[PDB]
């Protein structure tokens, strides 16, 4: 449909320069970011349509839950470790579905049960790479102003307006999510 | 639902 500012998307006030092309922000703790991302399956479906070689990004946020900073560590370490699909079901799980996540040593348990060596997972926590990927992710969270998730930036310039998209199922939601992603990408 | 967030 037509694509209009104010309609499916917003201008940031402040761009960011040097972003990736497609710049997601969630939360573990979110039950938003879980029916987005794990049952709608929307950013997958965003992923899986995009131009070839499209810069993406998925940062977690601090701000929601008592160890959202420490969620965002692990977000962190499932990317340095690359098994953020293996991963991402079992933390969702395990702090919505049956919350056995209390605490830093049950996230260290969810990686290992989720396939992860201990002994990887050992070594990258508190990483230069991880470290780095914390960082990362923190001042995109500032950068792009996200207050609220889940979220998606396009060039740094355009804010995803989730609600502004029209559709007569979640199927189509997201096949229609994708739909205007792919117009702002040649924008 | 996708109407609302979590902030």
Known sequence: A??????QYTNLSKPVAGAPQ????????????????????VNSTVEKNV?????????????????????????????????????????????QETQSIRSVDDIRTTFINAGVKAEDYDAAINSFVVNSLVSQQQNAV????????????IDGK???KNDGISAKSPEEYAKAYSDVVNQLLMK | PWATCDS
């Open chain 1, 2 to 7: 037509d694509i209009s500012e104010g309609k």
């Open chain 1, 22 to 41: 497609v710049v997601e922000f969630f939360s573990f703790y979110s039950p938003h970011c879980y029916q987005f991302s794990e049952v709608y399956k």
């Open chain 1, 51 to 95: 131009p070839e070689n499209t810069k993406m990004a998925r940062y977690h946020v601090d701000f929601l839950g008592p160890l959202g900073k420490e969620m965002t560590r692990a977000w962190a370490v499932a990317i340095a470790l690359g098994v953020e699909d293996q991963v991402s079901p079992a933390l969702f799980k395990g702090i």
């Open chain 1, 142 to 153: 500032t950068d792009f102003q996200i207050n609220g998730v889940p979220a998606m930036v």
């Open chain 1, 158 to 160: 355009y804010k995803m």
